[PDB]
Amino acid sequence: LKDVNHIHPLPDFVRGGFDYVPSDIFSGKENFEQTLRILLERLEFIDQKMVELAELRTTLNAEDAILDEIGRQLGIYRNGLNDPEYRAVIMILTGNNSKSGTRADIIATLKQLFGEDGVTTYKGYNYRLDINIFNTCMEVTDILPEIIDMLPLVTHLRVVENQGY
Amino acid sequence: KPKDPIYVWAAADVNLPGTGRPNKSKPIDDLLAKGYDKGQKPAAEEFNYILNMSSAWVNWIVNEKFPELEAEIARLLAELENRINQQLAV
Protein backbone atom coordinates (compact mmCIF):
# COMPACT_ATOMS: atom_id res chain seq x y z
CA LEU A 1 0.00 0.00 0.00
CA LYS A 2 3.07 2.21 0.44
CA ASP A 3 6.49 2.23 -1.18
CA VAL A 4 9.33 1.16 1.09
CA ASN A 5 11.81 3.49 -0.65
CA HIS A 6 11.22 6.89 0.95
CA ILE A 7 13.74 8.69 -1.29
CA HIS A 8 11.39 10.58 -3.60
CA PRO A 9 10.83 14.23 -4.52
CA LEU A 10 8.63 15.82 -1.90
CA PRO A 11 5.08 16.02 -3.32
CA ASP A 12 3.80 19.58 -3.76
CA PHE A 13 6.82 21.09 -1.99
CA VAL A 14 6.00 24.66 -3.06
CA ARG A 15 2.45 24.94 -1.71
CA GLY A 16 3.76 23.73 1.62
CA GLY A 17 5.27 26.48 3.71
CA PHE A 18 2.82 28.86 2.09
CA ASP A 19 0.37 26.90 4.25
CA TYR A 20 2.22 28.38 7.24
CA VAL A 21 1.17 31.96 6.46
CA PRO A 22 -0.82 32.55 9.67
CA SER A 23 -4.27 33.86 8.73
CA ASP A 24 -4.09 34.93 5.07
CA ILE A 25 -2.80 38.28 6.35
CA PHE A 26 -0.40 38.66 3.42
CA SER A 27 -2.20 36.49 0.87
CA GLY A 28 -3.51 38.50 -2.05
CA LYS A 29 -0.91 41.24 -1.65
CA GLU A 30 1.21 40.06 -4.63
CA ASN A 31 4.29 41.73 -3.12
CA PHE A 32 5.21 39.37 -0.27
CA GLU A 33 4.22 36.24 -2.19
CA GLN A 34 6.69 36.82 -5.01
CA THR A 35 9.52 37.44 -2.56
CA LEU A 36 8.72 34.22 -0.70
CA ARG A 37 8.10 32.21 -3.88
CA ILE A 38 11.41 33.27 -5.41
CA LEU A 39 13.33 32.02 -2.38
CA LEU A 40 11.39 28.78 -1.89
CA GLU A 41 11.53 27.77 -5.56
CA ARG A 42 15.33 27.71 -5.29
CA LEU A 43 15.06 24.84 -2.81
CA GLU A 44 12.91 23.03 -5.38
CA PHE A 45 15.90 22.61 -7.68
CA ILE A 46 18.19 21.47 -4.86
CA ASP A 47 15.51 19.14 -3.50
CA GLN A 48 15.10 17.56 -6.93
CA LYS A 49 18.83 16.97 -7.46
CA MET A 50 19.10 15.27 -4.06
CA VAL A 51 17.45 12.23 -5.65
CA GLU A 52 19.63 11.88 -8.75
CA LEU A 53 22.66 12.09 -6.47
CA ALA A 54 21.36 8.79 -5.06
CA GLU A 55 19.28 7.42 -7.94
CA LEU A 56 21.93 7.81 -10.63
CA ARG A 57 24.68 6.20 -8.54
CA THR A 58 22.98 2.79 -8.72
CA THR A 59 24.61 0.32 -11.10
CA LEU A 60 21.41 -0.10 -13.12
CA ASN A 61 21.30 3.53 -14.27
CA ALA A 62 24.90 4.67 -13.67
CA GLU A 63 26.34 6.44 -16.70
CA ASP A 64 29.73 5.43 -18.10
CA ALA A 65 31.43 8.53 -16.66
CA ILE A 66 30.80 7.20 -13.14
CA LEU A 67 30.05 3.52 -13.84
CA ASP A 68 33.83 3.16 -14.09
CA GLU A 69 34.02 4.13 -10.42
CA ILE A 70 31.60 1.33 -9.51
CA GLY A 71 33.58 -1.14 -11.61
CA ARG A 72 36.87 0.10 -10.18
CA GLN A 73 35.84 -0.85 -6.65
CA LEU A 74 35.12 -4.38 -7.90
CA GLY A 75 38.28 -4.73 -9.99
CA ILE A 76 36.36 -4.91 -13.30
CA TYR A 77 38.17 -2.44 -15.53
CA ARG A 78 36.64 -0.99 -18.69
CA ASN A 79 39.38 -2.25 -21.04
CA GLY A 80 37.80 -1.77 -24.49
CA LEU A 81 34.18 -2.37 -23.50
CA ASN A 82 31.46 0.15 -24.32
CA ASP A 83 28.74 1.36 -21.99
CA PRO A 84 25.82 -0.95 -22.92
CA GLU A 85 27.83 -4.16 -22.49
CA TYR A 86 30.16 -2.87 -19.77
CA ARG A 87 27.05 -2.93 -17.60
CA ALA A 88 26.48 -6.57 -18.56
CA VAL A 89 29.97 -7.79 -17.65
CA ILE A 90 29.72 -6.08 -14.26
CA MET A 91 26.49 -7.97 -13.55
CA ILE A 92 27.84 -11.28 -14.86
CA LEU A 93 31.06 -11.31 -12.84
CA THR A 94 29.33 -10.18 -9.64
CA GLY A 95 26.66 -12.84 -10.02
CA ASN A 96 29.32 -15.52 -10.42
CA ASN A 97 30.23 -15.37 -6.71
CA SER A 98 27.17 -17.41 -5.65
CA LYS A 99 27.06 -20.00 -8.43
CA SER A 100 27.77 -23.69 -8.94
CA GLY A 101 27.63 -24.10 -12.74
CA THR A 102 24.65 -26.45 -12.81
CA ARG A 103 22.50 -26.89 -15.90
CA ALA A 104 19.59 -25.07 -14.27
CA ASP A 105 21.98 -22.43 -12.95
CA ILE A 106 23.66 -21.76 -16.30
CA ILE A 107 20.30 -21.17 -17.98
CA ALA A 108 19.47 -18.53 -15.37
CA THR A 109 22.56 -16.40 -16.04
CA LEU A 110 22.13 -16.56 -19.82
CA LYS A 111 18.49 -15.59 -19.28
CA GLN A 112 19.40 -11.98 -18.43
CA LEU A 113 21.33 -11.47 -21.69
CA PHE A 114 18.99 -12.88 -24.36
CA GLY A 115 15.41 -12.51 -23.14
CA GLU A 116 13.18 -15.50 -22.46
CA ASP A 117 13.43 -17.55 -25.66
CA GLY A 118 16.71 -16.20 -27.03
CA VAL A 119 18.94 -18.98 -25.68
CA THR A 120 19.00 -22.78 -25.53
CA THR A 121 21.60 -25.32 -24.41
CA TYR A 122 22.35 -28.81 -25.72
CA LYS A 123 24.31 -31.34 -23.67
CA GLY A 124 26.70 -34.09 -24.71
CA TYR A 125 27.98 -37.37 -23.28
CA ASN A 126 31.71 -36.62 -22.95
CA TYR A 127 31.75 -33.21 -21.25
CA ARG A 128 30.31 -31.58 -24.38
CA LEU A 129 28.06 -28.56 -23.90
CA ASP A 130 26.55 -26.26 -26.52
CA ILE A 131 25.14 -22.72 -26.36
CA ASN A 132 22.63 -21.36 -28.88
CA ILE A 133 21.72 -17.68 -29.28
CA PHE A 134 18.65 -16.37 -31.12
CA ASN A 135 18.05 -12.74 -30.08
CA THR A 136 21.41 -11.20 -29.18
CA CYS A 137 21.24 -7.45 -28.56
CA MET A 138 24.99 -6.91 -28.04
CA GLU A 139 28.19 -8.03 -29.73
CA VAL A 140 29.21 -11.33 -28.17
CA THR A 141 32.95 -11.69 -28.80
CA ASP A 142 33.82 -9.21 -26.05
CA ILE A 143 31.37 -10.89 -23.65
CA LEU A 144 32.71 -14.35 -24.49
CA PRO A 145 35.58 -14.46 -21.94
CA GLU A 146 33.14 -14.32 -19.02
CA ILE A 147 30.81 -16.93 -20.55
CA ILE A 148 33.65 -19.41 -20.04
CA ASP A 149 34.32 -18.46 -16.43
CA MET A 150 31.03 -19.67 -14.90
CA LEU A 151 31.39 -23.21 -16.29
CA PRO A 152 32.86 -26.31 -14.61
CA LEU A 153 36.62 -26.79 -14.64
CA VAL A 154 36.43 -29.40 -17.43
CA THR A 155 33.69 -28.12 -19.74
CA HIS A 156 33.96 -28.53 -23.51
CA LEU A 157 32.04 -25.69 -25.12
CA ARG A 158 30.75 -24.64 -28.52
CA VAL A 159 29.23 -21.23 -29.26
CA VAL A 160 26.90 -20.53 -32.19
CA GLU A 161 24.89 -17.35 -32.67
CA ASN A 162 22.11 -16.58 -35.13
CA GLN A 163 19.10 -14.27 -35.45
CA GLY A 164 15.79 -16.03 -34.86
CA TYR A 165 15.26 -19.79 -34.88
CA LYS B 1 45.88 -32.10 -54.43
CA PRO B 2 43.48 -30.44 -51.95
CA LYS B 3 45.41 -29.60 -48.82
CA ASP B 4 43.23 -31.40 -46.24
CA PRO B 5 43.24 -35.16 -45.56
CA ILE B 6 39.87 -36.73 -46.28
CA TYR B 7 37.89 -36.94 -43.03
CA VAL B 8 35.06 -39.48 -42.94
CA TRP B 9 31.95 -37.89 -41.48
CA ALA B 10 30.42 -39.74 -38.52
CA ALA B 11 33.04 -42.46 -38.87
CA ALA B 12 32.27 -43.96 -35.47
CA ASP B 13 28.90 -45.58 -34.76
CA VAL B 14 27.39 -44.88 -31.34
CA ASN B 15 24.17 -43.96 -29.55
CA LEU B 16 23.39 -40.27 -29.18
CA PRO B 17 21.92 -39.05 -25.87
CA GLY B 18 19.48 -36.82 -27.73
CA THR B 19 17.95 -39.62 -29.79
CA GLY B 20 19.20 -42.73 -28.03
CA ARG B 21 19.56 -44.28 -31.49
CA PRO B 22 22.57 -45.18 -33.65
CA ASN B 23 24.16 -42.07 -35.10
CA LYS B 24 23.49 -43.29 -38.66
CA SER B 25 20.32 -44.76 -40.16
CA LYS B 26 19.49 -45.59 -43.76
CA PRO B 27 16.93 -43.21 -45.30
CA ILE B 28 13.86 -44.99 -46.65
CA ASP B 29 14.24 -45.60 -50.38
CA ASP B 30 11.23 -43.37 -51.06
CA LEU B 31 13.23 -40.42 -49.77
CA LEU B 32 16.36 -41.54 -51.63
CA ALA B 33 14.46 -41.43 -54.92
CA LYS B 34 12.54 -38.29 -54.01
CA GLY B 35 14.51 -36.01 -51.69
CA TYR B 36 13.31 -33.21 -49.44
CA ASP B 37 10.74 -30.45 -49.95
CA LYS B 38 10.12 -27.03 -48.43
CA GLY B 39 8.81 -27.42 -44.90
CA GLN B 40 10.70 -30.64 -44.23
CA LYS B 41 13.52 -30.55 -41.69
CA PRO B 42 15.99 -33.45 -41.86
CA ALA B 43 16.40 -36.06 -39.18
CA ALA B 44 19.96 -36.20 -37.87
CA GLU B 45 20.38 -39.91 -38.63
CA GLU B 46 19.76 -39.59 -42.37
CA PHE B 47 21.99 -36.52 -42.63
CA ASN B 48 24.84 -38.33 -40.88
CA TYR B 49 24.32 -41.46 -42.98
CA ILE B 50 24.44 -39.56 -46.27
CA LEU B 51 27.55 -37.60 -45.33
CA ASN B 52 29.28 -40.75 -44.07
CA MET B 53 28.45 -42.44 -47.38
CA SER B 54 29.85 -39.65 -49.52
CA SER B 55 33.00 -39.24 -47.39
CA ALA B 56 33.89 -42.87 -46.67
CA TRP B 57 33.59 -43.88 -50.31
CA VAL B 58 35.85 -41.04 -51.47
CA ASN B 59 38.32 -42.09 -48.77
CA TRP B 60 38.20 -45.66 -50.07
CA ILE B 61 38.74 -44.54 -53.66
CA VAL B 62 41.69 -42.32 -52.79
CA ASN B 63 43.52 -44.45 -50.23
CA GLU B 64 42.74 -48.09 -51.14
CA LYS B 65 41.73 -48.57 -54.77
CA PHE B 66 44.37 -46.39 -56.42
CA PRO B 67 47.42 -47.26 -54.27
CA GLU B 68 46.42 -50.82 -55.17
CA LEU B 69 45.98 -50.05 -58.87
CA GLU B 70 49.30 -48.29 -59.50
CA ALA B 71 51.10 -51.13 -57.71
CA GLU B 72 49.21 -53.72 -59.76
CA ILE B 73 49.94 -52.06 -63.11
CA ALA B 74 53.61 -51.63 -62.20
CA ARG B 75 53.85 -55.29 -61.18
CA LEU B 76 52.13 -56.37 -64.40
CA LEU B 77 54.61 -54.41 -66.52
CA ALA B 78 57.52 -55.76 -64.49
CA GLU B 79 56.34 -59.35 -64.89
CA LEU B 80 55.83 -59.00 -68.65
CA GLU B 81 59.32 -57.52 -68.95
CA ASN B 82 60.69 -60.37 -66.85
CA ARG B 83 59.04 -63.02 -69.03
CA ILE B 84 60.42 -61.40 -72.17
CA ASN B 85 63.80 -61.35 -70.41
CA GLN B 86 63.79 -65.13 -69.91
CA GLN B 87 62.67 -65.48 -73.53
CA LEU B 88 65.61 -63.36 -74.72
CA ALA B 89 68.12 -65.08 -72.43
CA VAL B 90 68.07 -68.19 -74.62
TrEMBL record, chain A:
Name of the featured protein: Uncharacterized protein
Organism from which the protein derives: Pectobacterium phage phiTE
UniProtKB/TrEMBL annotation, chain B:
Organism: Pectobacterium phage phiTE
Part of the intact protein present: 3 to 92 of 554
Name of this chain's protein: Uncharacterized protein
